[PDB]
């Protein structure tokens, strides 16, 4: 959720400088999002291997 990736529900830029800061903001949010999906995929892989072992 937006608060879990660092964005607020009302996050927005209002001028070009705020948009330039928002570039890095959305970049860091995309990075943490990809890390979270990678961790979820590794956990699903552990689920599959444990299912084969069971």
């Amino acid at each position: 959720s937006l608060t879990g990736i660092g964005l607020t529900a009302t996050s927005t830029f209002t001028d070009a400088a705020t948009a330039k800061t928002m570039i890095a903001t959305i970049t860091t949010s995309l990075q943490t999002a990809t890390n979270k999906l990678s961790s979820l995929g590794t956990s699903s892989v552990g689920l599959d291997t444990h299912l084969t072992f069971v």
Binding site: A16, K20, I23, A24, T27
Partner: protein
């Protein structure tokens, strides 16, 4: 007096041609904004272009 009136009319023509020199409401010749900052990277680094007032 005729050459003076011609010089005055040409000066007004130059002023109007200078004030019309804009593209989508922004301009590098009218002398408004000091410079335009164009994109240059994924990180949002600017490509500075100082205004050239005419």
């Amino acid at each position: 007096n005729a050459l003076k009136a011609d010089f005055e009319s040409l000066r007004d023509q130059l002023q109007k041609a200078a004030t019309n020199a804009k593209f989508n409401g922004v301009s590098l010749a009218d002398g408004s904004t000091t410079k335009l900052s164009f994109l240059a990277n994924e990180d949002g680094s600017n490509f500075t272009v100082t205004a050239q007032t005419l």
